[PDB]
Amino acid sequence: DLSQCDREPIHLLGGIQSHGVLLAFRGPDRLLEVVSANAQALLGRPPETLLGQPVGRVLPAEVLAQWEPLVARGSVRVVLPAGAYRALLHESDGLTVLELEPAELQPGMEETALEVVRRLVSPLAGVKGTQALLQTAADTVRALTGFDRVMVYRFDADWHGEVLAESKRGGMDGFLGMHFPATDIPVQARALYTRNPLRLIADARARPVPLLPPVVPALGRPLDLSNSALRSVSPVHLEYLRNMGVGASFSLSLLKEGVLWGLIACTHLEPLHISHERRRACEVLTQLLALQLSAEERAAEASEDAHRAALLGQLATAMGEGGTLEEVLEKESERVLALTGAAGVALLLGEEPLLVGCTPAQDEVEALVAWLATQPFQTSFHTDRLGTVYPPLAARADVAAGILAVRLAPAAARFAIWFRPEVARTISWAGNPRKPAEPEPGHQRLHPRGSFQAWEETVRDTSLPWKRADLGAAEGFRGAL
Ligand SMILES: *C/C=C1/C(=C/C2=NC(=C\c3[nH]c(/C=C4\NC(=O)C(C=C)=C4C)c(C)c3CCC(=O)O)/C(CCC(=O)O)=C2C)NC(=O)[C@H]1C
């Protein structure tokens, strides 16, 4: 992909976080093949001397005595000398990978989890706007995690993001409404998070624990840690969190109708571990928000549709109430523009264009009509930045930053073109986006940027996007012309 942020193979770093232990076994004798260098944390004896041993001679009796439900469920609670641990299994590179990490200590967590689910599945939830949905999603995740700050972060069209909503304890500073470059979460990070929706950085300042040996010897590269709960993250991102003053981090992928829409990102000023079962509870809340968002969006799409269907009906009644088509369209100007949420429309019904609302002058309409007759667009053409593809109108963002054109004749140049002004938006970046990272001379190390202080730009010359109901309304109005 684009830069070297994207090139770091974050699933192949060969380290796990220090609060857990990892063990990987091969073949039917279950021979210890990959083990973390801290494995004495939970194995009585030094890990390098257990490379090669069958699992019955490696693992504590405790874990062994739970081996059956472990194998069949992929997850079980074990009570070690060192406390209650949560043991997880998965498969990677032809190995069975056992991960142990401290287990949930509150017997009532799940009970607490069901109560915050209620807040978010609630009878008529999200009824005071989807902003209120985002806030409640932030509120319930922080209520359940104890994280100092919880945010809802949304990826925009170019994969830079913005904070839509924030929930934070009193005195925490936040980033509500701020924008962040796409490189802050690079492309191979976003692909990993599409397949693994959860990740915890329990202590941003702790050192990664290496795996032994540093390659899986069959393959000659490190063990793949894509599906590991204990995967230690890219050192650059740990530096990023240090620069933010963040001691611990936990984020959840928001997948909406197949694709990565955003994250629920949590941060804490001190280290903080969240149990595997408490993070699975937070995942239920994220899927719940994604469900509520989809439901609310489809409903909005449906209600908008009915509005445009009401309109063409009111225009149909209006025609055939007397007069010519140009006559009734002129009187029904407001409805004609409403169909696509436009400020103006030019109709080429044969002769010189009929100009309704604010449109460019007659001559600019004639030039554009002649140019649209050249392009390939089947039946309808639309853009929200006319000026990047049609320079003669590039300076008239006041009346024609976006257009929506429909063909009224096969080879002839007959069209309805709706126009939209620009919509200026003043955005605050968290840091200077022209300098999204501080590379070392020679560009081999790379470091995060040093400051996240507000940096303001106004985006000009672009209209509100054309909505699906806009294109539907226009297609339906071609018949009447
Ligand atoms: C040149 C490389 C860069 C880089 C690398 C990077 N970032 C990664 C993960 C990650 N970044 C964020 C960003 C944010 N956290 C916030 O709170 C906000 C806004 C308020 C932002 C924009 C997040 C949330 C994550 C996910 C991990 C987490 O802490 O929850 C990764 C992948 C880490 C991994 O191993 O998975 C990489 C490689 N960041 C840069 O800024 C540049 C320099």
Numbering used by the authors: 9 to 489
Please share text taken word for word from the publication where this structure appeared.
The reported structures are of a SaBphP2 PCM in the wild-type (wt) and mutant forms determined at 1.65 Å and 2.2 Å, respectively. The cryostructure of the His275Thr mutant is essentially identical to that of the wild-type, except at the location of the point mutation where the hydrogen bond to the ring D carbonyl is absent. The conserved Histidine, although absent in some myxobacterial BphPs such as SaBphP1, stabilizes the Pr state by forming a H-bond with the D-ring carbonyl and the Pfr state by forming a H-bond with the C-ring propionate. Serine is absent in the SaBphP2 wild-type protein, and likewise, the mutation His275Thr diminishes the Pr/Pfr photoactivity, possibly as there is no stabilizing amino acid for the D-ring and C-ring propionate in the Pr and Pfr states. Upon Z to E isomerization and by rotation of the D-ring about the C15=C16 double bond, the conserved Histidine 275 must move.
Phytochromes (PHYs) are red-light sensing enzymatic switches first discovered in plants, with homologs in the photosynthetic and nonphotosynthetic bacteria. PHYs are composed of a photosensory core module (PCM) and an effector, enzymatic domain. In bacteriophytochromes (BphPs), the PCM consists of three domains named PAS (Per ARNT Sim), GAF (cGMP phosphodiesterase/adenylyl cyclase/FhIA), and PHY (phytochrome-specific GAF-related) [Fig. 1(a)].1–5 The effector domain is typically a histidine kinase, covalently linked to a PHY domain, although other nonenzymatic output domains can be found. However, both proteins bind the same bilin chromophore and share a large amino acid sequence identity (38%).5,14,18 Biliverdin (BV) is an open-chain tetrapyrrole that is highly conjugated and allows for reversible photoconversion in BphPs between the red light absorbing (Pr, λmax 700 nm) and far-red light absorbing (Pfr, λmax 750 nm) states. Here, we report three crystal structures of the SaBphP2 photosensory core module (PCM), lacking the effector histidine kinase domain.
